[PDB]
Every structure is written in structure tokens, then in C-alpha cells.
Amino acid sequence: VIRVFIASSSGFVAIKKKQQDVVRFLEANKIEFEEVDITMSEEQRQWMYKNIPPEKKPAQGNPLPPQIFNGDRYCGDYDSFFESKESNTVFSFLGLKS
Amino acid sequence: GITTIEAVKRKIQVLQQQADDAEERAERLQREVEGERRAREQAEAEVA
Amino acid sequence: DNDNSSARLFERSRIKALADEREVVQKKTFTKWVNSHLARVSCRITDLYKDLRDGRMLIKLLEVLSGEMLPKPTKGKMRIHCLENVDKALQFLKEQRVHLENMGSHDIVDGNHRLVLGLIWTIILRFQIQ
Amino acid sequence: AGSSSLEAVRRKIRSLQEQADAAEERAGTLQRELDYERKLRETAEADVA
Amino acid sequence: DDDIAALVVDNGSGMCKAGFAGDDAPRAVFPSIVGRPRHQGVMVGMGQKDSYVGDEAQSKRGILTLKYPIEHGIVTNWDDMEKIWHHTFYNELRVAPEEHPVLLTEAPLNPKANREKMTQIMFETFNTPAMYVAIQAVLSLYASGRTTGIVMDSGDGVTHTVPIYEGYALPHAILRLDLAGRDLTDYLMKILTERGYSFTTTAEREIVRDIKEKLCYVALDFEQEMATAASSSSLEKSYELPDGQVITIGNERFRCPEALFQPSFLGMESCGIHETTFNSIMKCDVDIRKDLYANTVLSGGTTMYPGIADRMQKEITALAPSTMKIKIIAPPERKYSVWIGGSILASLSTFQQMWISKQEYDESGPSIVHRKCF
Amino acid sequence: DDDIAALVVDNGSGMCKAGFAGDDAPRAVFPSIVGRPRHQGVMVGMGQKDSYVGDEAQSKRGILTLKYPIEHGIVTNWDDMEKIWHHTFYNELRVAPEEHPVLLTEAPLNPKANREKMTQIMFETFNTPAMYVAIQAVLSLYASGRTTGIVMDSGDGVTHTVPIYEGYALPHAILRLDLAGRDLTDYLMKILTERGYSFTTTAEREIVRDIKEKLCYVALDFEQEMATAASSSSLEKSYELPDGQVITIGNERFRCPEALFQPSFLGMESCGIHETTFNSIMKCDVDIRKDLYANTVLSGGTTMYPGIADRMQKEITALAPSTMKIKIIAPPERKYSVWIGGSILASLSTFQQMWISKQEYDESGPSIVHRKCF
Amino acid sequence: LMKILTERGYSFTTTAEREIVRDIKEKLCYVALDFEQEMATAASSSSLEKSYELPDGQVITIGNERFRCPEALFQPSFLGMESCGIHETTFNSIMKCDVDIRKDLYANTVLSGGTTMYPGIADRMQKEITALAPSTMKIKIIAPPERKYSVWIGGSILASLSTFQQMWISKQEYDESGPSIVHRKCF
Amino acid sequence: DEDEILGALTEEELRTLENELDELDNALLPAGLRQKDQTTKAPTGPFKREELLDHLEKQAKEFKDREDLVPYTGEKRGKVWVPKQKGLNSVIKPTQYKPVPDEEPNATDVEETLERIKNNDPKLEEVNLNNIRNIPIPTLKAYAEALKENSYVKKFSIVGTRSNDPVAFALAEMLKVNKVLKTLNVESNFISGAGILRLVEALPYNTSLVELKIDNQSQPLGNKVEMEIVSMLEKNATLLKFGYHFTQQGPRLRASNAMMNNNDLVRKRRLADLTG
Ligand SMILES: Nc1ncnc2c1ncn2[C@@H]1O[C@H](COP(=O)(O)OP(=O)(O)O)[C@@H](O)[C@H]1O
Numbered sequence A: 001v002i003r004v005f006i007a008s009s010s011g012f013v014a015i016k017k018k019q020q021d022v023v024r025f026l027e028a029n030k031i032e033f034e035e036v037d038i039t040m041s042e043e044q045r046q047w048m049y050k051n052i053p054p055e056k057k058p059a060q061g062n063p064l065p066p067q068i069f070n071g072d073r074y075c076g077d078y079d080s081f082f083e084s085k086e087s088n089t090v091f092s093f094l095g096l097k098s
Numbered sequence B: 001g002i003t004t005i006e007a008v009k010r011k012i013q014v015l016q017q018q019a020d021d022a023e024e025r026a027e028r029l030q031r032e033v034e035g036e037r038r039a040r041e042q043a044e045a046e047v048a
Numbered sequence C: 001d002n003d004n005s006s007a008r009l010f011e012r013s014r015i016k017a018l019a020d021e022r023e024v025v026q027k028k029t030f031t032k033w034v035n036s037h038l039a040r041v042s043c044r045i046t047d048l049y050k051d052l053r054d055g056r057m058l059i060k061l062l063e064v065l066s067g068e069m070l071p072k073p074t075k076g077k078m079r080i081h082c083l084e085n086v087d088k089a090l091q092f093l094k095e096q097r098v099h100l101e102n103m104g105s106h107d108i109v110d111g112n113h114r115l116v117l118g119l120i121w122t123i124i125l126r127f128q129i130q
Numbered sequence D: 001a002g003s004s005s006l007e008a009v010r011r012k013i014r015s016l017q018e019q020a021d022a023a024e025e026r027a028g029t030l031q032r033e034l035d036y037e038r039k040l041r042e043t044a045e046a047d048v049a
Numbered sequence E, F: 001d002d003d004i005a006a007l008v009v010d011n012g013s014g015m016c017k018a019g020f021a022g023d024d025a026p027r028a029v030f031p032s033i034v035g036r037p038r039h040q041g042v043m044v045g046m047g048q049k050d051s052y053v054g055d056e057a058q059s060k061r062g063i064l065t066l067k068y069p070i071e072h073g074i075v076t077n078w079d080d081m082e083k084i085w086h087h088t089f090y091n092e093l094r095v096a097p098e099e100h101p102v103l104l105t106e107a108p109l110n111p112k113a114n115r116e117k118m119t120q121i122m123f124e125t126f127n128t129p130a131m132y133v134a135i136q137a138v139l140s141l142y143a144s145g146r147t148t149g150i151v152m153d154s155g156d157g158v159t160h161t162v163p164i165y166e167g168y169a170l171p172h173a174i175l176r177l178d179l180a181g182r183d184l185t186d187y188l189m190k191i192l193t194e195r196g197y198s199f200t201t202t203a204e205r206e207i208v209r210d211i212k213e214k215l216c217y218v219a220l221d222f223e224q225e226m227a228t229a230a231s232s233s234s235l236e237k238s239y240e241l242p243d244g245q246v247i248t249i250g251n252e253r254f255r256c257p258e259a260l261f262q263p264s265f266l267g268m269e270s271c272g273i274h275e276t277t278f279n280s281i282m283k284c285d286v287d288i289r290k291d292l293y294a295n296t297v298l299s300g301g302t303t304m305y306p307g308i309a310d311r312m313q314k315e316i317t318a319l320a321p322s323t324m325k326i327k328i329i330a331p332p333e334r335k336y337s338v339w340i341g342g343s344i345l346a347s348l349s350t351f352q353q354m355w356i357s358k359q360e361y362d363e364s365g366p367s368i369v370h371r372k373c374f
Numbered sequence G: 001l002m003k004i005l006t007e008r009g010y011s012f013t014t015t016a017e018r019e020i021v022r023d024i025k026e027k028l029c030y031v032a033l034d035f036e037q038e039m040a041t042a043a044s045s046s047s048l049e050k051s052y053e054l055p056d057g058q059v060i061t062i063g064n065e066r067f068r069c070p071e072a073l074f075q076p077s078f079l080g081m082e083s084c085g086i087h088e089t090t091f092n093s094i095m096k097c098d099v100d101i102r103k104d105l106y107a108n109t110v111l112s113g114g115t116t117m118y119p120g121i122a123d124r125m126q127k128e129i130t131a132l133a134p135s136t137m138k139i140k141i142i143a144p145p146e147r148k149y150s151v152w153i154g155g156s157i158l159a160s161l162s163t164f165q166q167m168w169i170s171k172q173e174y175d176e177s178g179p180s181i182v183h184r185k186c187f
Numbered sequence H: 001d002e003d004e005i006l007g008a009l010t011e012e013e014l015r016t017l018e019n020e021l022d023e024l025d026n027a028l029l030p031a032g033l034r035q036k037d038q039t040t041k042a043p044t045g046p047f048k049r050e051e052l053l054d055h056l057e058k059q060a061k062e063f064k065d066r067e068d069l070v071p072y073t074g075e076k077r078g079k080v081w082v083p084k085q086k087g088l089n090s091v092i093k094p095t096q097y098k099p100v101p102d103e104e105p106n107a108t109d110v111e112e113t114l115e116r117i118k119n120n121d122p123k124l125e126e127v128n129l130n131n132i133r134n135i136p137i138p139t140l141k142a143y144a145e146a147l148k149e150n151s152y153v154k155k156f157s158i159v160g161t162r163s164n165d166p167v168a169f170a171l172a173e174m175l176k177v178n179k180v181l182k183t184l185n186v187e188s189n190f191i192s193g194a195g196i197l198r199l200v201e202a203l204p205y206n207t208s209l210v211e212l213k214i215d216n217q218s219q220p221l222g223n224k225v226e227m228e229i230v231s232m233l234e235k236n237a238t239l240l241k242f243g244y245h246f247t248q249q250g251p252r253l254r255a256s257n258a259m260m261n262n263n264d265l266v267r268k269r270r271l272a273d274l275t276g
């Protein structure tokens, strides 16, 4: 099932816009999903930190909130989502068969 | 054309007509209420 | 409270009538003085309150009396253009060491009777014809 | 925003319309002021009598 | 005689406008889009001069990715914005930037580095002799011809309301809502998706924006429009795509702009635009609220929906006391009024002291803009 | 019946503190917030419960909207306040209110109906045997341990100064200024928008308040510290958001509480805290001013920024005549003083005369409080 | 009035709202003939309530505060002052005079100033002075309707007299004797 | 020379301006019908997306490349500023507060509860419908209609059900009929000002409801609406608790005074019963 890691309260507008963009895309196409708040629960955020492959980390600080998983297998961040959005390779990006 | 010239003309003195009529009405009411105020003051001094 | 009504009657009739006497007669007196100096240029005033409200003719007045070249009036039909035009004449009066207070561009543009009449009276009194 | 002359014509039309509109809105206030003053002078004359 | 005045450049979030000062209409109007080749190096580098700018960028929607240099009123990419300014100066206006001053606009509440970067780019790259930065909502009041009222400006990326009384502005009553045209476009795509028509890429973003511009209106009563649209198909309209394929919008026409008044549809914790205007009015003093009620001014492209003025009048009249009179002013030319304000501001003589000189700039650095502007 | 111990409830705008009388510290301290479900979400893991109260509401910030029942020291919403009282009595202390007397705290100058409504709610909803309403600043002077001095109280909702000389309070010199920590939180949001970080939601307001409580200090000299912050990078401090990002406050650390001493930053007409205290002293009689200068007492959470005592001593010494001496008394435990003096007041033997009995309420209605309590 | 209007919940703190409070005081205040009965009557019923309209369009209700604000003239202890009221001040000023001239001063009490225009000051003042004075002396309160401008009007009477043309301070006298001439020339 | 200015404008634009002045727009027309149609062709097909994408790509491929006069080299034509030259460091972390156990979701059948209300069941005492997925508003109207004749239910809550104005109208019709419902809860709904006004309009007709909670609506009530609630709340005397946050201060004061008077009447009748 699609799991989006989101932060309900953030100091940056772009993070909110990206999270709502992902939620809008998932809601528009009848896609099965579920959301987990990283600010509400500490253990889920800590699990999200070590779930990420080391090559896609920011060089500076913790990774950005919007992350997409299905089950326990990792799909990508917002940037890879946008690449798949324009390349029309979205269902392969999330892993659901079209 | 000539028809557009006449239409522009007609709109010009129509709008000028409402402007002039409204200004004339305002002027008439202004002077008339001034005279009315003078009459009211001269009437009230006698009660005083 | 009939005595309160009597005092309201007094301040409504007597004070306002005694003010309006002097206001009307002084405005009529000032109209002739401004039209005499404005007669040399092709200009004339029909109403003192309405005509001084663009500010161009006040600049004409100051230019005629001073006989010295004022800054060129800004062309424009907006309210702010009139404000800036009146501000030019007010600044010229200020730099000629003529004292004005409670005098603004928006006071002239809004057509306040007392301030317009006071401006004309101060121009009559303190400004030098020369 | 097709040309400056068009928008200037619009601005002149707006000025010509709003002059009449403001003058009518002032005339209404003048009329009610006149009615109030007439009522006052009628009451004053009755009190004189 | 001062090299035919300054150049007024209004850079909105969605579209850019530019023209000479003293002219009553902008000369150059074009969207702010930087389109790039997607992934392909097919057929001897098709997509030559990779940075595609403006109308010529929007012509090649099929083979390019369309990217906006300005997001939410803030410049994310500065090379793209430099490209936009260079294309404005040298390709359409075609005048020397070193011979004329430049006037620029900005939203009220922004990060402080934006003004410094604008000053640094305008002086170091284009070598302009003088420059100034102003606030868009003040220029809207300049264009409206008034000096007292509350001004609302809703662009493609930001909405903001400022009050001004007798030429004096109150900084504590300025409100900034992040509810604008792009959110409306995304909501229109979202509600169109479950109807049966799916739009994903930026080439469809332009089409959805065109559909919203041509066929959208603000409902006076929302539940009445629910009942009327459910009962009959009289409200339905037909849109024609660039290759036949005529589609029917229908119920969505008045559902997109309702997110302006109810942000719950967009899933954002924010108040309505009428509530924002009312709260900005109530934060002012007691004696000046009457003039602000009687001088409400609308501006921006987002306010170009039909039937928004009377709807906002009804909503404000509900909130306001019944004794006052509500006066919503919506000029038909309001979409350009911000730029028109610039054309008024540079024309005044008393504004000549407000220019930031280059000789003043190279003594103080980019920090002169804070003490010189606003 | 010495077993019957009164309950002391200090009731501020920000937090509520409750505990048994005669104790050193309040047993329960928690913010008075009533959180309610959002409209944008269709809720995650909430059952038949309608609202969340206090700490559990603070934990689930992401799915709720947070509301404060007490507004500027005035209870606008009485049902929410009743919920706060029920949570205090049944979830925090786990004691039946029908057995113990209740002591409450209340601002000096406020609507008359507030005391009557509090007495009404106590005697009818909770059916307490006895109750009493006390003023906060007198309790602060009780906790200080002296009977002579001027009490300055700054809470989350209101600031007020009262003078007391030898157990006699002067009602004509009491001053109430509406400048508290919540306005400072809103100003911190406004000046954090300047750097680039944006906080709009009430949960973001809680984040901003938590930033302010830890990273704000009052400068002894403002002009020195502005130049120091501009010159070097020594004043920056880093804070971690719940999402994971790191922000740097820097210059704003001494700019947020400076609005206490200069309200013109907020657009407010009124004067600063030191001017208010000086005016309250000069309203008094001539020969009691010497004792009032030497016994100035600080109170409230808002007065726990570092460096308030030195700044306020310097300001009053600048205002006061040079031949007199100024003493500022800031206990390290002052944040709970309004509670602690109350725990003293219920412990006195003669205070058993002051209890409002159930019978007296039954004959005299809710108007007994005006003749019974100051 | 601002302090007791805070008691009902309406807040006025700025200098601009002080003029609004002054207008409220001028329009909706009066002096009660008996203070305790008026308080009891105002507590019993709502017939004494009045409504005022704020400049922003909000509506407030004064009610009990109509007669409490002018009562501070007769009881300064409401304001924290320990001084006596205006009636006691007038009676004390009468008692400081000689015995022979007290009757004429009792019969010729004149009110003036804009503060003396609350509805019912004349009757209350007559009642209080009659209570203080002996029964044989009869009190006579004189208050012209246009008392607010009386200080001006007598001045217009004063400058038109023929004797007053010799009572000026000349420019030459001031130039000779400095600014200290006003103490010799004026009372 | 305005005539010369109009002559400088296009002659077709002159006809357009005359017709536009005659048109003065479409204020008489409703807002839906004011804006013009784009095309006249009827809708066709199910909108295959790939044809649109292929035609857009083809149109992008066959297009003139316009040649700009000035290419962008990114050169600098100005002077560089060159400014003049002359644990304690630990990062503070926020408070975690305390985790809260997850509440068990509401499991109450809608149809069974509605049937039990329709059957006038003695055992059913309290009805709770808070936080239920996608409740039908005809079903809510049926609940409001059916609970009129049920005298065995005392508490009713519809918090977080996305209720709208018709539900408020149905409840307004309810409150005149029923004499048993002690508590009503309509918080966190989408009821506008008119529905709240219609709800408080039913208060003078019944003397059995002692608690109302209308807080946390999606849109604010306004001045006129609150003016109506406070006046016809002063009409009613039975109501004991009213849950709302008033923006305006005068209505807030009057509502507080009225509710205080109601509870004072309750206290007075208790004292009168105690005396006998
Ligand atoms: N004719 C129109 N009808 C309806 N909406 C429009 C129209 N023109 C533009 N818009 C909306 O306004 C937006 C453009 O606003 P714009 O004025 O470019 O904002 P900015 O202030 O950033 O320049 C578009 O995204 C579109 O949603």
C-alpha cells in the first residue's frame, strides 16, 4: 500500500506544496494510499531515516519530509516523482501495475 | 465612418448632459438650502 | 434638558450665522482682488473654492505676483497630480519665508473653506508685491 | 492594454460618468438637508406663535 | 528629456509585463516560462538553445518541459530570471539598459535577500544607472486614482491585502495569504481527473490554465448552483482542444473558483479571502474603518472571474455591521493596473529623489535598498 | 476538620496550574487549549470524542485546530473553560470537587460579570462547599514575603501593575496594559517571515512560542546589540523543527522582547513597561513613593527573559530622581508566585472567615462575590 | 468614564477613542437628584439604559454608568482625591466671607462653564447648599442657558466699556518695564 | 483633440466601442451565462489522451525557430561591490510532550440505529454519530424526521458529519416538536449562518433543551446573525448552556447576561422549592 511520509506543520512553504501535490495526485487517480505524520510519531520518522538508501541523502542535514514507499520497499522523493510525472512513468515509479 | 462619428458625438453630449444637469441640480439645491438656513436662523432668534 | 436645547439652539443659530456673514463677505472681497491680478493673463475665477482646486491657477497667481519663474506644472487629471501641483505652490510660498501652518495639499484639494480663505488672506498680507 | 490611447479614452469616459454620479449622490444629501431645515423652521414658527 | 523616462517592469508570478514610463499601456506582455528539452538529444540536438524563453517557449509545448522561475512570489532560480530580464531588455523592448532606469515590483512580506539579489543583478549585470523597488498593492491604489482604501492583489502565486489611509500605510494590518491561481489550476486538474479527463504534464498545465481563463465564474450561491447543475445541463459549456476532441466542462466551471472562498477543498488550513479582507479591516483603528469599507479595491488576474465583485460584496456585507455601506471597486482593466501604477509613479517629479543611484550603490552595497525603499 | 484542604487553581491565559493548599509547588501545570477536529481531513484515529484538552491536545497538533478559551484575561468561551476545569479536577488531581474548597485567581480590572459567572459555575456545576476569588498581584506580593511594594505582573494575556503600602492597595493607581507574550509570539511570526521561514497554522504558532521561550533574551542596550549582530556572526543560535530542518534566529533574539519596552514596533499607542510602572508609582501619594521604589517585584512567565532586571532597573533609574535608590526584586521561582501566595492565603487561620459558604450563595445569588471579595 | 466603561467590557485606551468617550459623556450623562434611589432604580429595572453607536458601526449600552460619572463631582472620593465636593467648596467659600454679606451671596449664586451643563446640576446644587445653609437663608441658583460661553460674553462686555480704554497694557509700557508689568496692571 | 484620438483608433474598433457602450457587462444576466462560448462544435469521442499528446508533439516539431537578435552569454557589465575589510554550541531541540493512545473508531450501524429510533425503543438512550465515513444527508434528514416522535432519546451528536444547511433546517423543524432531547451537538460542521439562525429560531417554541453547541463552523456567522441569536436567545429562558465564541463584544455580553439570568432563575426555583 502507498505510504507517504508527511509533516503537518513545517516552516517552509515549498514542503507543504510538495506534500499536497503528492496527496492531490494520489487522490485524483483513485490510488490506494495512507499517510504517516513524521512530527506526530518519532519512531516512524527514525525508521524513515534509515529506510532511505545512502546515495539519495542531502549532503546537509536530515532528508526532506516528502517520501513515498509501497509496503516496506522505497519508491522515491518528490523530485523523482516529478521526473516520473513528466516522463509518464508514474505507475512503474510507485510500483502499481497499470 | 460618418455613423461612428455621429455615435461618438451623441455619446459625448449625452454624458455631458447628465454631468451638466447633475451639477445644475446640485447648485440649485445648494443656494436654496442656504436661503433656507438663513430663514431658519432669523426665525429661531425670536424664540430666543 | 430644555436649557441644553436652548444652548444648542444658540450655538446652532447665532455662532454659525455670525461666522457665515464674515465668510461670505470676505470671499466676495477676495474674488475681486484675485481677479484683478489674474486679469493680465487670460484667466478668471467664477468660484473661489472650486477654481483653486486643481492648483494650476494658484501657480499662475504666484507667478504673476512674484514676477519670477515657477516650476512647470505637471499635467494630469488624477487627484495626486492636483496634490503635487498644489504642493509646488505651497513649497514656493514656504521658501519665500511666508509662514503657513495647518496647510496641506489635500486641504486645498478637498476644498476646505477656512483654509482656502486663510491662504488667500495670508498671500494678501505677508507676500510682497514688488 | 491594447494601446495607450484606448485606455485614455476609457479614463475620460470614467471621469465624465463619475462626475455626474458624484453630483447626483451629493444632490440627494442636499435634498434631505433641505427637508430637515424646513421642519426646523416650521417648529420655530409654531413656538414663536 | 531624461532618455524617455524609466522602464517599468512588472514581473508577476505567472506572466511578465514591461513598458516605458508615462505610457498608459504596457508595450511587451509575455509569460515567464523557461522551457528546456526533456531528455532527448535526437536529430542533431533538437532543442537547440536549450533555454527557451517566452512565447517562443510556449509554442513548443510538445518537446519541452515548462518551468516557472518564480514560485510563490519568490525567485527560486536566478539564472532563469536573468534570462527573462535579458530577453525583456534586448529582444522585445530592444533598448539599452544602461540608458534608462528600471522600476520593479514585489510582494509585501518576502525574504529580505530577494531585494538585495534584485539590486545586485540589476546593477552588476545590466549596468542600469538607477533603480527602485515598490509594492504591487500600493501601485494598484496609485492606478485606481484614490489615496484611501484597502487594496487586494491576488496574483498567480500570492494574495495580499494592505490598508492605506490618507496616504499613510499601516504595516501591522498587512495580510498575506498563499492562495492564488496555481492552486486553482491544480484543483481544476484534480476535479477534472475523476470526470474522465486526465492532465499530468506542463503542456496540459497550459491547456488547463486556458480552460480556467475562458470558462470559469464565481457562484453567488453555491448550494443553488449544486441544485441547478444537478437538475439541468443549462450551465454546461463546451471546450475545443487544439486537435478537435471537444469536451464538456459542466459542473466544474463554478467549482474551481470556490476554493478562493472555501480553502477546505484544497486541503489547506487557511481562512477565506473575504475573511482575510475583513480581518485586515478590523485590525485598523476605529475611526478609519468607514473609509476602508467604502473604498475596497480589487486587482490581479485572479480577480478577473465574472461575478466575483458582487459575491465578495455579499460576503463582506454579511460580516460588516448593517449600518455601513460596502463599496467593491473592480475596474475592467484591473489585470494590468499594477503596471499602470508604475507608469504613474515614475512620471511624478517628486519621485526623482527616490531613485537609488549607482554612485550611491557602490558605496553601500546591496544593503542600500532596505533604507532607501519603504 | 483539618483534613479538608482547599484546592488552589491559578488560572492564566496560557497555562492553568492546580494543587493542594500548603504545598511548595503546584501539582498539575498544563496549557489551557481546547483542540477541535479540522475540516480538511476526515480524521485519523479519533472515536466518539469531540475535542482534546490540554496536553493530549498539544500532542495531536497535526489533526486539530487549537483554541484558547481565555482571551486577554477575559473568558470569551465559557463551555471550553468548563471543559478545562473538568479536566483539571478529574484527570489531573483525581479528587472530587464536592469535598474541597476552591480558590481562584483573577485579573484586577475586568468585566464585573466574570466573577459572578465563575462563582455560578463553581456552585452549580461542581457543587463545591465553599469558594473564594482573589486578585493575582496581591497573591504575588504574598509569595514575595513583604507587605509593601509595587507588583508588576506580565502573563500570557495581560500586564498589570498595582501598588500596595502596608496592606492597603490604591485602586486609582492600578494600571492595566494589554501587552503580553501572545502578542510577542505574533510579532515573532511576523519577523520570522522576514528571514524566510513561514508559520501560519496554530500548531506553527505553538512551534513559534516554543522557539521564543528558549531563544529570546532582552538586551541591556538595543543600539549596542544591533551593531554587534550586524558586525559579527556571534549571536546566531540554531533550532530544530519537528520535521527535521534547522533554522537560525540570529538578529531577532533581542528584537522580539524589545516590543515590551517599545510598543511602537507593534503599532500600539501605549507606552512601555517601565513607563507604565513609573506612572503607576507617580499616581501614588508623595511620601509613600520612597518605599515603592525600593520594593518593585516582578512576576509572571513573560518576565523570565534573561536581562529584564538590569534593563528595567536602568530605565526606572533614568526616569526616577537621582537622589533615590531603585531595587528590582526578581525571584528565581517567580513563574509560579501567583499560585504560591495563594497556597499561603488558604493556609492562614483568619482566612476561614473569608470563605463564601453554600448557604450565603443560596440566599444571595451570584452577587455575593462583590460584597465578599475585593 | 473610561475606567467605569472598562467595567462593562468595552475597552478604550487610545487618544482617538478618548474623544468618542467624551462624546458619550456629553450625550448620555445626567446628575441624579438622589444617588442611592437612582442606583436602586437602575439595579431594579432596565428603563434607564441607553444605546450609543460607535464610529465603526458597533452598538454599546451605557446603562448604570450614566449618573455615576457626574457624581464624582459631588463625591471626589470616587476618584481617590480626599477633597470636598463642589457644593461644599461653594459653601466654604461663602463661610470665609464676612457675616454681613453672606445673605446676598446666598441669593446670587451663579453657575458657569461647560462642565455645569449636565441635566440636573442646578437642582442638586440647590438641594445640597440648602441642606448646609441655615433654614432662614433661602438659596437661589442662577444658571443661564448659554452659560458655556459666558466667560467669552462678559469679555465682549468688558472690552466695549469706555473706562477700559485706559486699562490696557500699552506697547510702550511693556517696552519700558519688561514682561513683569502684567502683575501690576492686571488683577 | 478627443475626436482626433478616436480617428486614430481603428474604424472597426469604433463600431465595437459603440456596440460595447450600448451593451453597458451583462449585469442583468446570471453569472453562469455572462461569459461567451468558445466554439460551436458538439462534444465528440471519449478523449483518447495519446492522440492529443502526439499532435502536440508533432506541432512542436514543425515550427519555425525564431532567431533572437541578442544571444545570452551571461556577461557582467557592472562593478563588483568588494565590501570593506577591517555544550554552548549545541542545537536546541523541541519538546516531544507525550504520546497518546489511539482511540477505538466509532462502530455504530446507521440503519440499525435509525430503525431503533423509528421503533421507539425503551433501551436506546443516547445516539452518537461522531466521525463516521460519508453519512448521507437524506439519511440525516430521515434521522431528524424520525426522532421527532421518539421520546426516549435525550442526547444527540452529529459532530464531524459534514452537515449542511438542509440538516440544520430539518433540526429546526425537529426542535419545535420534540420535548425530550436534553442535549444537541452540531459542532465542526459546514452549517452556514442561515442554518444557525433557523436553529435558534426554534428555541422559543420548546422548553426542554438545556444545551446547544454550535462552535467551530467552517464560516463565521457575522454581525447580523449574532445579533439575531442574542435577541431571540433572550426570548428563551429554559436553555442553560450555550456553546459559541462571539467575535463581537456586545452580543457576547448580552448572551452571557441572558444565560446567567436563566441559571439564576433555576437557583431561585430551587430556593422556592426548598422553602415550600
Ligand atoms: N481572463 C481571465 N479569466 C479568468 N482568470 C484569469 C484570466 N486571465 C488570467 N486569469 C488567472 O490569473 C492568473 C494570471 O495572473 P497574473 O495577473 O499573471 O498574476 P501576477 O500578479 O503573478 O502577474 C492565471 O493563472 C489565471 O488563473
Ligand SMILES: Nc1ncnc2c1ncn2[C@@H]1O[C@H](COP(=O)(O)OP(=O)(O)O)[C@@H](O)[C@H]1O
Pocket: F011, F012, F013, F014, F015, F016, F154, F155, F156, F157, F181, F182, F209, F212, F213, F214, F300, F301, F302, F304, F305, F335
Ligand atoms: N522560560 C521562559 N522564558 C521566556 N518566556 C516564557 C518562559 N516560560 C513562559 N514564557 C512566556 O510566558 C507565557 C506563559 O505565561 P504564564 O506564566 O503561563 O502566564 P499565566 O499563567 O498568567 O497565563 C508563554 O506564552 C511564554 O510566551
